[PDB]
Structure 1
Amino acid sequence: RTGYDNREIVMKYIHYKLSQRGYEWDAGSEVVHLTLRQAGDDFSRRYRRDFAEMSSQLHLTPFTARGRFATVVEELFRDGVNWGRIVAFFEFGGVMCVESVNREMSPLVDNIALWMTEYLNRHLHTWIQDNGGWDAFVELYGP
């Protein structure tokens, strides 16, 4: 119906975060993916302390990742949604994927991509559509 699939925004974002570390191949039209990447890179520069704390406190394992993902996301959106919190959600998913590869649990990346897609589709999609859609995010933060 929308003409797009949020799974693609998730897959492209995770691919970019892994590629930045040399964890996935990338030699280095659509504007949403570039806008989101840039916003997330800036978010992690501004909130470097929160990023470093999140990157060392996760202690991810295959049985604990699901619960940790849900708990952090619930904390993130407890006071409501805005674009910055959506950018923070992608950055959090990125940290979970990078940590999963670091801990030799690369298959978890596919599960994290599914949980992010499901949360965007079921819990954030209404807010996004009510707030001008991805079009409004690009109008505010895009080139």
Structure 2
Amino acid sequence: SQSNRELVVDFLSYKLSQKGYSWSQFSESEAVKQALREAGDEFELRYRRAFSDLTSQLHITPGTAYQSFEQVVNELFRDGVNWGRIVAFFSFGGALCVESVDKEMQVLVSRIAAWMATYLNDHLEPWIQENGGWDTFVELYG
């Protein structure tokens, strides 16, 4: 896609790495990526329980449709968009990739990356642009 696609790929590469997997076998910009990597690790520590209940709701098979992903991701934004909720979303996507590689369905990695870039573009990009862009996120979270 574009700059959102590039952000999704960086985050998923990091999440995969933390679990010992490489992206290569599946295929302010620096400050945005670093800040989002750090924000996702923090969110994963603080909301261990609630996050586990989220990831439980979706088990990605080669048959899962994007709409099934949207329905659970939509729960994160029920009451609107915010940075914490966008971080949760990245984290969520990262956990589905890890789960995918764990179950030897490494083909779903590029599929989740596409689903995420799409979801950011369609639903989150207007609120992001309206709230200072990714540079604001960095100034707030870096």
Normalized against structure 2, the TM-score is what? Answer: 0.89
Counterpart amino acid of residue 31 in structure 1: A
Q: Distance in 2 between the 1:102 and 1:123 partners?
A: 29
Q: What displacement does 1:78 show? A: 1.5
Residue equivalent to 1:71 = 71
Indicate the RMSD between aligned Cα atoms, in angstroms.
1.8
Long gaps (5+) in structure 1: none
Q: How many residues align?
A: 137
Q: Distance in 1 between the 2:97 and 2:34 partners?
A: 19
Q: 1:25 to 1:11 in 2, by over 3 A?
A: closer
Q: Distance in 1 between the 2:5 and 2:107 partners?
A: 17
Normalized against structure 1, the TM-score is what? Answer: 0.88
Q: Sequence identity, in percent?
A: 64
1:85 and 2:76 correspond:
no
Is residue 55–residue 92 contact of structure 2 (8 Å, CA) maintained in 1? no
Long gaps (5+) in structure 2: none
Counterpart amino acid of residue 123 in structure 1: H
Aligned structure 1 segments of 4 or more residues deviating by more than 6 angstroms: none
1:20 and 2:24 correspond:
no
Q: 1:140 to 1:110 in 2, by over 3 A?
A: same
Q: Distance in 1 between the 2:106 and 2:46 partners?
A: 28
Residue equivalent to 1:9 = 7
Higher helix share: 2
Is residue 55–residue 99 contact of structure 1 (8 Å, CA) maintained in 2? no
1:111 and 2:107 correspond:
no
